[model samples]
Target: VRSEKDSMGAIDVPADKLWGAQTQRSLEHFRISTEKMPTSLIHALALTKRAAAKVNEDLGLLSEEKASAIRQAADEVLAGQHDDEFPLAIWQTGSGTQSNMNMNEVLANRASELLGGVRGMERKVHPNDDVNKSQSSNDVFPTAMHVAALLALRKQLIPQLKTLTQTLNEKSRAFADIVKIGRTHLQDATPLTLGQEISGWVAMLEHNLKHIEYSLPHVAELALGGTAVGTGLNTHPEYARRVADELAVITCAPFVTAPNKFEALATCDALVQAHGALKGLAASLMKIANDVRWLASGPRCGIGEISIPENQPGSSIMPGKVNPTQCEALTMLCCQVMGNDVAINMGGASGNFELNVFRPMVIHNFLQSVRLLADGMESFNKHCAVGIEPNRERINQLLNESLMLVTALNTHIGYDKAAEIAKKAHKEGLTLKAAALALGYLSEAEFDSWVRPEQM
Candidate 1:
């Protein structure tokens, strides 16, 4: 064992192993919270494994015997084997190099077993040479992040968003004629269908989906061939393109090489832009979730326009109370994803001299965003989005009190008289009917006949 002290005389690591310096440096360099590092980084790890496999296949980097073993090993892990290999506290401090090494080592062992070799034999199938050849942490880490994000967005989040949209569409068609009070700035403003309000939410989700779709090409374009700093140094010229092609097919998304390797490797602008898209999505969902939770807050006290199914007993202290647990959780997760974008934003601009100091955190936050969004979407759909029940009676009652029908009165009673009637209705605790009857502007029956909320 070897021991060395810094100028301050603090002993770091027992400097016995060759990698002891690396271990000690990580301890000294980072003081960030480890609690925030989530296990959901698995999403990024899975993506990296997949991309590496495809690159190996394309470049013939691994022998067919080794490739087959690797695939089988991956399948085993994907099927839920050797889970302990994915422990926390890996090289999450720096550019994810330690994490890559950990993954490489685990994958190599598993693959060796599948290839009829004893575990921990780094000779026949070396981890770095055979598994991660022709790639760099800079490229692979972000590539993994993109792959995972694309998967979560396309496979999970977008589909649930579609479900919510379809639910709103069906309700819109079902209640097209039913009117409800519309509020602007939380004050009664006009009459509109409750369905129309939900339809706007659907439209916002659609807008968000469009934004995600547009950002895909940029996210999909990868930096695999750039190796360390866009030089393709130890890798072949055709390496990046071929790897990208296979990864695109594997990921089932558009994947291409950036025109400039240096730009792609050294700068993280593409990922920052993608995070912006995620933030927009979170904002839209936050609005939808807030509306759902508020509308379903109380059966007797709050708006009570909707009800969410009770998934868990809301409280032990309260005799009868249920919470908007799913909606609230979804909203909270949305806030986290939005905040994570700030980290991505900061990381994207910090590249200096050859490396960015923020790769692990960048990927860490993004993977968190992708996973939390996916989990939140699933939770929202299962517990709330798919189970929302409309309170038609409350909706109709709100519509009946709407003064917005006064606009329809203008068509029959003359705009000037209608304005006078509206002012009277506001001043007194009277509706359009009472105001119109008192003014002698129109008969009560005539007023009720023309002042339909739907007409407004």
Candidate 2:
């Protein structure tokens, strides 16, 4: 271990560690959770520092030499050369001061080393003065949260969501020519094409995409200028937009300065609002999974009309029985996403006075929800959906046996005639045509002409 100095004086940090005194203090403190701050947040922190340094130098607030060292060191962190460097738990200081300082200290040390300074103790560079110039933990952490959340949605969730839509699109088109019995509350209602049902699923995915997309621009707004509180204290005037522009360049995302720094810094509603979409996605996903499982149930017993690929055995006792495990798994994760949204809403409401103390928890839930949805969706699509097939024999059998085909006879025969035919067929256990012919409701040719399922 080597000694590093902060305002609180010297502390011993591990020799090989890239972090400094505050980070070591946090490691020794906050023992509530075993997990560390997320890697994506750390990456965004590094990106924030890099952008700040460049903007600081460009604004003539920091030296060219220090900015260059900070940029190179930040680039190293961005490339994941020091993932182990950020080790603070999510339960640390409400402001995320320690985690923010972890980035500052790590970047400061490496930047100092780049300028021929020692690693543990910076010879020239200071964590706050050089690395964290024009920033405070309050604003920095909030900005990083926005960056990380946006990246999680854009890079991870949306692409997977798009893949699901495309896959469902093909299936919907392919199933169009096949007509089957329609169900409402497990009762056969009418006849519709299989492709039409599939198209509804695809439409759900597409609609949820719009909801998710609508929440994005709010998240894209960054809280950079809100230095300590909402007051841009100790920061350059050009700092906010310049840093946002730089991050936009680096991330290929359209990040803009939040119009109200006070609102952005004090409240986490941007994330809360966006989670609305994640929850919307969860609702849609739950339906998709449950619908598929219900349709795929029992090769011999349950609906038995649709067959989904049995990725694996579901029961230990029954050797030949396979289940829709993917659907079960997807629906389980959807439940988790919904639960996560509750936590995020709870956290977002804790925007007390000038700052939200529940930021870490909110971002954690947000990130997890997106990841779970993306992973569960990809798994469901690959394992269950691709293997789905309409059992033509079963579909036709169920369709022909359905009494609701009497719906087609309603216009030609009166409602009473159609109702009487359905009830007579059920009471006598006869075919619809047989019941209609027996009841003298219509002539045989008339019954045949109007009772065609395809015409309906």
Candidate 3:
């Protein structure tokens, strides 16, 4: 029997209830020093309430008072107080039975109050039968994950990435006339407009945004009806469609039931697809952040192509120092997302029979990845990527130091002759025009005309 400390706010659990091995193990596992898991995914709860209402309505299962009570209780839960519900746990077991139990317990307790009754009676407002009727952990957990992740992506993540996109575009336009040396394999290769190089990053983010958009449809088609083992064994005939319709109205989100319940319940491919989109986003942002960080590395010694604003002290030992923390953080975040991808993939593939056994881990990590990416995108865009000042003097200096001006020489002289001119210039330290004129490839005046910084 479970005891309640109803009055004083102290939680005194009996030894039997308190010492659940798996529960304690999970508590220890997720107890990290890092930031709290973002609440952005809480949007899924609102959708849950909507879908729950629809499901109850379709089944003709509850009285108006009970239905209203369920919806209201879910509203408060989704607004986010009962956070003790989400314990930190690894996804080692086959199915998320523990997680389902957690949700049921929390909702049952809270929902009791909404219905003017005692908690745990499973009568006034039940958690499993009344609250989570016609569902299984297999379906509910994944469906909740999709709703939360999709809302996070659509509401926060995509908008932040789009902001970053605009910031890069601004830099591209500003640097349009600046020419710089392009390197392939860390070797100086050719001359390209700095604007053109920045444009490539802009293009990558655009492509990533579309990739994310495409994956959204997978989330929209939720599989809540695949109760038990995709058989809908416990649910009534019309339950699935009714729940989808209700969820659509409640969340104002696109909602559809999965056509193949078996596949939906058996595999975690949808989670993988969502994680893949997040990974692609991280990869694209990594390029943008790393490039900007390095380009703005120094006021004196490094590439010094641009100037990123100093956000914090770079080191404790050195005075007058600032570092590219934003860039470093972005890179670190990408690695985290990739690692989470491995965990998600493992969970997705590890399901041997009827269940993925690793649903809790997949749900938790996928949400974590989305939340980190959303926050990281915002931070990088506003603080570091957007207001970065271009170092015009350094840009000109680096361009002049390079022999890639030889690329423009190709259009003027033949590519073969231009290579010879570049070789001679590098060897003798003469300007390209000087070397080209010496070789009689072009007139001195012609060389001067074609070799201006614009052409490079």
Candidate 4:
């Protein structure tokens, strides 16, 4: 163990670890969960530090030597060269002060090493004084959250959603002429083409895509210059705007300084809005998954109008049982996202006077939802949506047997006659066609002409 001294005096730390006293203190204090902070958030924090260093160096606030070392260390972190260095739990300080210091210490130590100093030596590059030059945890943590979420959406989630939408559109076109029964409240009500049903799911996802797209800009606004509270204490006049501009150039995303720093620091409204969009998407996914599971119900007993690809042995006791595993997984993940959204909403509403005490929780759930949706959509698209095959014989049989087809006779024979035909068919245990023919309501030729499935 090596001894590191902060204002709280000396503490023993793991000699091989890159972090210093404060991070070690945090590790000792908060042992809540095995889950560490999100890797995307870590990268975002590194990127933020890199940009801040550059801005500080440009503003002549940091020494050239120290800035170069910090930049190099931060770039290594951004490239994922030292991911093991960030071991802080997501349940750390509500303002994420521990995590911010954890990052500051790691980068400072790494910078120190690059400058020919051993670890834990703070004289050359102090963690807070040099690495966290003009920023505070209150602003930095939320800024990192925004950066991480925006990149995940643009680079991963949005593209996966687009791929799923395209696959749905293709299936819609392929199944356009395949007629099937439409259900209302799980009861058969009307006839619709299979393609039309799929088209509805496509529309739902597209609507969700619009919701996500609309929420992106709000999350892109950064709170970096707000400092300890929203006051910008000890920071350069142009630091916030410069850091945001630097980040925008590096990420190719439009990141701008918050219009009102106090509001940005005090509330997690942008993340809440983004999670709301994700929850909307999760709802659509659940609806689509449930629909598919019902449609692909059974081969011998249920409404088996479609066959999903048999990818695994679904049962332990049964001889040959295949389940809608993709749909099951997708729906389960949707439920998790919805639950995560609830946590995030509660966190967003827990802001006090100067800063929200729920920063880590908000970003934690936000990244979780983003990753779940991206990965879930990909798996579901490949396993279920792409591999589905229509059971043409079963669909035709069900369509023929449906008594709702008697409604077509209403236009010809009148409503009371059509109702009479339906009632007689039910009472006599006969097909609607057979009942109509026996009642002499219409000939077989007229029945075929008016009750055409394609026309309906």
Q: lDDT of each structure?
A: 0.70, 0.86, 0.72, 0.90
Please tell me which predicted candidate would have the highest lDDT against the true structure: 4
lDDT of 1 by residue, 1-456 (tens): 354233345344432222222334445554455533343455456556656666676677667787667666666556666555554353364567766655665677667767777453233555666777777677776566566666666776678767767776776676566677887898878777777888888788789888877877777667777777767788777777887777677667777777777777676777788779889989989988998888777767778777677888666777346788888788899889989998888888988866675776787777777778777777787777767778889877666666777888666768899999888888887777778888888897797788767666
Q: Pick the candidate with the highest TM-score.
A: 4
Q: In model 2, which residue pairs have backbone atoms overlapping below 3 Å?
A: none
Cα deviation of 369, candidate 2, in Å: 1.0
For 1-456, candidate 2 gives per-residue lDDT tens digits of: 899888889999999998999988878878776767778888888888888888989989889999999999988988889989888888877788888899999888888889988787645788987888788889999999999999989999999999999998999998888888898877888888889999999999999988898999999999998788888887777788899999899899999999999998899988999998888899999988888888777777887778877766567877546677888888888889899988888889877889888888888788888879988888988987888888889888888778988888777877988998889899888788888888888777987787777755
Model 4 spans with C-alpha error above 4 angstroms: 314-320
TM-score rank order = 4, 2, 3, 1
The candidate 3 region of ten consecutive residues with least summed lDDT is 12-21
Compared with the true structure, model 4 gives a TM-score of 0.96
* Candidate 1 collision pairs: none
Residue 414 lDDT, candidate 2, scale 0-100: 79
Candidate 1: worst-modelled 10 consecutive residues by lDDT: 14-23
Q: Against the hidden true structure, what lDDT does model 1 obtain?
A: 0.70
Query: Model 4 over residues 272-291: C-alpha lDDT tens digits?
Result: 99899999999999999998
Instruction: Give Cα distance to truth, residue 239, candidate 3, Å.
Output: 1.0
lDDT comparing candidate 3 with the true structure: 0.72
